[model samples]
Target chain A: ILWKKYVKENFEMNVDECGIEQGIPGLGYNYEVLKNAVIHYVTKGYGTFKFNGKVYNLKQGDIFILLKGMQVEYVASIDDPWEYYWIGFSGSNANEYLNRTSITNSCVANCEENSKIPQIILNMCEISKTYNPSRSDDILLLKELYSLLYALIEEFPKP
Target chain B: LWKKYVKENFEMNVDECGIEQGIPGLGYNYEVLKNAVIHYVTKGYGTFKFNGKVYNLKQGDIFILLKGMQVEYVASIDDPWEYYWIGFSGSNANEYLNRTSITNSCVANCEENSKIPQIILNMCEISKTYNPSRSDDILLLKELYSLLYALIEEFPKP
Candidate 1:
């Protein structure tokens, strides 16, 4: 019965940035920091992500939770690099969720080979295309993100 | 603008040491806390009533109470529990609890030996000792953040 402590700040989501080639505009390996939590669902490609000086090689069916203010550097693999859809959110409760779920810094939400995360992301994209800043749209966006989280967890039940 | 809907809010927060001889002066009481509570039973046995259901609680048992959810509970007769709690209000905490799976199911029976006590004590001790001038209040609030993280890690959803 305890959902009254953590709160959300202004947030932006469904900011889909898809890159297939070596250099996708605004998407490249760089030494920088973010002020909010960014989640990525990899539908395609291979890449190396350095999070807080810890390197993780990532591939498809992986969802990565990147924490705020952490030094994160991710590069597209030269061979079969990655393509992904991501949503970034800023909220005071964001870190609490990560800590409670043990998602922490640079761990992946692993899914099965035929998981529905890809489709869920696509579905969210569809909803995002007709973007509206109405009150109803905000609720819809929240529900969409909620479902996205459940889909990721459902596809990847704890080992 | 975003947080105006579900931002950080609080009402009352307190910590108490319990006795074991008999029923607590406060018997199994019920409340739908207008806010939320993170309760820790560090030592002894008890039971809490929730969702029209009853649950046995032991050491290392964590209970998360959401707003508008009624809870009826008290310490065991022969083995009263020692617990610490914090209550806060707002609309946004629900989303965070959902992520932790606490909203899905309330109880998480952690290992008997957990680091929960230390964290609770840290929170309480810091809160009790810190005579905040102005900046110290901010420091206390920051401590709450760490305390929240500790509670999440300690009380994993079952």
Candidate 2:
């Protein structure tokens, strides 16, 4: 229907391969404004986010969406430090698509293990294994990201 | 229309706010808008053909027509319809639409309340009386945003 209203901009996916936050030892408290829309899915441990003077706590299977322009202060939980894959995307629809999911309420949502939401992120990780910014790369990554977002929406925890 | 980002991006201009009445079977063909539109069935019942489906609209039901969506509206032949709609647009209009989930889906059944029509009338009166002054525009936009938030939150996901 009105799909054209949301057009993607320079979008790319990266994970544990060899970039930002590549090691667990480097994880610690950080305050920054991200340049892109980032989606974080906790695989292990926990973390906390403070934005708008509100604290958002995330643990296993808890997914959080941090949009661009939002200034957030966060720390990786000490005891069971949080480790996860995050996709950084930017576009006209980046924020729009995120609103459809439960993450909008507080920027964090608890997804069930059976939801296989983690697996979706894992699947994207595979694409990043040999990730490179090519014309063909954009096609696959774009489609996969959309699929992952849709799957996430279907798995949004019910109240 | 893709502005990278708008800070304090609360921007929008009022387009129209009034009632529509017509003869039996009167209808408007499928149309699209460049700006956002909100309508409430005021006096009678009607139907909207949108996204290949028909939504039978009745009094108290608020319909939101998002930018770029297809819609067909008609007055019921037996009991013709009348409507009050408020139209607006801005750089961040689409952002608000996404927040309400109306940009993706076209129609939502709203709560029945006297404040519904009252607020619409209020907005119209404000816009009609406001000047080409900064203070006036801000006041009207605030009222509009208030109405939109109420309309959207009133019809949250089931």
Candidate 3:
């Protein structure tokens, strides 16, 4: 049915926050400048990400890059809900790196089936649960964030 | 005994050099540079001489050489050091370094689990496979930024 019961967890660190989320059927969200984010569908289900009146359908193994600013609307499928992992980041090179990928224009792409993104996100989630992260954990967390973006670039390279 | 270079941009150059172990007295001499250089020791041990001081280096150590700084590094005879370095000069270079612990005094040690080593290795691997392109440049810079950010975390200002 139509509801917003998404499960979301975030690891709040310097410059980046990341987590896992599940979407509700037929639910939609609207925002302006909701930070720079990359959302990847992990297992199954469907959704639609709308930007500037253009809608991009999202399914398993699909990814969407939400650039920092612009009118954005993202909706879940009526019949099948969607679960995804996401990284919200901001830095000098965040936009520059995204500009080098297909996301510069379309903002979405189909990830390869063998992508390591799912496992990477899982590791991030596990580490985010650390109560008092040591310096090592801090570096590991940033590593996961960088790894996530690196994987996205590898998946949708557009020079 | 392997080396590769990517003239990433007018502002930066990235390189990786592997020093074979068991050499009697192998060393590197870098005279004055127009740009600043950041060297990350990825493997083995070494000694770095900069500014009239010598620093012992091991895996996970980061050393920087700014313009006009004479520097020499000698890999350990028993366990030579392999490193990834980036030489850069631009308006953005200082701004980027400001976000990290790297300052004018540029010798730092990363935590045991720091990902700087892996990120550099990953960047080097990417440079080996990809040709010079905008995408390649961005990918490499992103890794550099990641390394800097990790250092910032590893050595926060007191």
Candidate 4:
């Protein structure tokens, strides 16, 4: 268990993983900061996620954030198809602060009220386009990404 | 709260604390080590000899290991001396190893067997020895000391 505090920015593009769908049976590791932008997965066979006293079933294109400080178990049959893409960044106040922002709207599979997820994906693409800009601009863009995520979380699910 | 376990080859010399019999209280700090030696002060005033000079201590001078580390606390008193001592170490063959050593001796006095007072003394020693270079050594020593002290809980005392 690595225990220390530092500020870091990470980017994983088109990062994908696939496995026979038998839910990954394990507890979710807790981090002080985590901004999980997306988790897109398709399940051909039945799978179950046990976390926070709730069970979430996985179908095709299901996505979500396994909450912090909760144990998660994923159980799927060997014949099931499972694939996913996830973008996560963390630091101090990564969890609490992100939860307070609009970026949270783009989180899971059933987010119908807020369009924050689409906005974040758009912002990410824009930053990628200007990736060759000055170093200071790059830093500003990452901060802007975090801000966009926070904004999405706040605006999504609005009545 | 400092602890340790220590093991050493040589015997420690006894000495005394020079405080006016009952005026200023006698005290000192120490870090614990593994397979450590144990010592106590139960008399008037004198010093304990280790490595070289004497470490002076007074009545009720209790000391114990932090873990299962080896350590030696020298008594510092003048009068005929009334202290207790114990030697304990632990690991895979800890019990077997301690039993094999001829120098494995138990405290003659049972009254000073508890570790609370010794822990306080160790804390004092740590504060006094607080320096940059000694910080790392002190930390390692304290852990081993605590282990030995805990092992004493299961020590066969008669």
Candidate 5:
């Protein structure tokens, strides 16, 4: 039961998708070879993300960074399906900001308790739903993107 | 008496929209303005004066000052007001203003439950933590842009 998927484009960057996605047992999602990066924050339940022949467990407060050009398959737990907030973005500086955290190379992070990631992404979801985006909206989304990356670096700094 | 910040052409100030009663017969004054200004009252009572006219103000009132307009505002001694004032300039400034009832004159009223007050207050808090970086600028602009649109939507042209 996926929900709240929205996209904004133009200017120097784009939010390919920003919203909440839910998964059902045995009905996982096979993201068809992504073209943009998606930062997913698990807010409820548990799941497993399979990447490059490896499976990683996911749960609340976990951040999964699915980079571009990667093929992934994931499913929620049979007893506790997963729900997450995801922000998909692409821009010239995407790599620049994303590399500041371990997610680029490590793929997953244990977010700090006070991480602003969830709130910022939730803001994006609400904003996207409230308006018909324009240039200004694009800029707003870009700002949220940067904010998310900043918080990621703070909570999960790359060593 | 005030907390203010400037980023590029956008500026924001948090001040007592109500006046200090001790200074009897005197009130706050803006002798001149360089850009468009928006004042959102967050609490208390006050009076606004411009163009030889005075308008009563209270929590949830919005007062606007366009380029070159001068005005005076005083907080109620009984219940001094607090508000956020945002100043901005751009070719699209008025275009944004026109979306709200604010352009008809300098004063308009929003409901007590309006989100604009909190949004503007949030902007104030965000500005206070400025670190002078690319990221900080983006966040500030984002909040500002969000507030702008929020105002337009709250008081749609009608």
Candidate 6:
């Protein structure tokens, strides 16, 4: 069993009013699952396409997940009318089970969104702001980031 | 104007046995006071009538007044009931002014009589426990006695 040391990565993107649409149009890539992994996304009027499949709509207060090694495409309008926040992470069992989860995709809607997301995001943002690139070798901050993503992924609803 | 500092004096008696029936008549005596004072009776039983009304008291109870004092005597006993209490005075023009309009007596029954007596008894115990007859007098011990009395008198009622 490939037990990957936990790793975490965070990204933030904002699309201006009438910004160009963004998505993966071609063959998807694979990420070797060193461990169980999660991708948490929050956006307004965005959608996702996975495994050459249909586009899944994403709205404000929504959270999405992509299992480790799962091929997926993230789509957003060009009008830049949307703002998004995401965190990617991998942990133990990432390769064994999560990789085989049928390219799982889930989301949390604004009306039914988990109330804890905003607070989690705020904490992550604060951590990132104080993060020192020179000390990127430290895993403490990454562990915190992974924990939050894992929580959001485990909580997102599966369609 | 009546002198503001005139100290109104009153007498209190505590006995183990009940007082004689229908002995001392009830009446309010103190009048036009300029200070707030407390008259406390501890131990035994007695009847107090204030403003033409009569009130009864049992062990560990208190009868208080602001303007005047009234108490009816009862039959004394042979054993001499142990009664220990005192009077306290304080001045605040505002307090006296407000009390002048009130014509009622305040009565309280202190079910938790253990603390007040214990404080008094403790002082005596301490004096006997630490008898320093050969050594020069310790002034601090005297201060402790005063503190003990203050604590006894100011113990919380609840």
Question: Which candidate's TM-score is highest?
Answer: 5
Cα lDDT tens digits for candidate 2, A62-94: 877666667776668756677767666665434
Worst 10 residues of 6 chain B by lDDT: B9-18
TM-score leaderboard ranking: 5, 3, 2, 1, 6, 4
Candidate 2, residue A55: lDDT? 85
lDDT of 4 at A47: 54
How many angstroms is the interface RMSD of candidate 5? 5.2
Q: TM-score of each candidate? A: 0.42, 0.43, 0.57, 0.29, 0.59, 0.31
Q: Candidate 1 residues B1-158, lDDT tens each?
A: 00011233231122222222225534456566445666777688777888778888887777767767778777787778776655444333343444355555566665656655665556555555454322223333334444444444554345
Cand. 5 TM to true fold: 0.59
Provide per-model DockQ scores: 0.02, 0.02, 0.14, 0.01, 0.19, 0.01
B143: Cα error in model 6, Å: 54
- Strongest candidate by lDDT: 5
Write the residue-wise lDDT of candidate 3 on A1-159 in tens digits.
Answer: 111212222222232555666888899788886565545454578988888878877788777766767678888899998877665565544555565567568776776769877788667666665523434454455456656666767877776
The better-scoring model by lDDT among 1 and 5 is: 5
Q: What digit string (tens of lDDT, one per residue) describes model 6 on residues B1-158? A: 00121232111111011111222332234452422332234445556556677666665655544444444433234222223332223222222223221223455554453344443333333434343232101211222223223333443222
In angstroms, how far off is B63's CA in candidate 3? 11
Candidate 2 runs further than 4 Å off: A1-159, B1-10, B113-116, B128-130, B133-136
Candidate 3 vs candidate 4, lDDT winner: 3
lDDT for predicted candidate 6 compared with the true structure: 0.36
**Which consecutive 10 residues in model 4 chain A have the weakest lDDT in total?**
A12-21
What level of docking quality does candidate 5 show? incorrect
Q: What lDDT is obtained when candidate 4 is compared to the true structure? A: 0.38
Model 4 spans > 4 angstroms off = A1-47, A75-80, A101-109, A113-144, A155-159, B1-158
Report the poorest 10 consecutive residues by lDDT, candidate 5 chain A: A3-12
Q: What is the clash count of model 2?
A: 0
- Model 1 per-residue lDDT tens digits across residues A45-139: 77777765677878887777666566677877777778766665554333333343434523666766676666756565555555553323333
Better of 2 and 3 by TM-score: 3
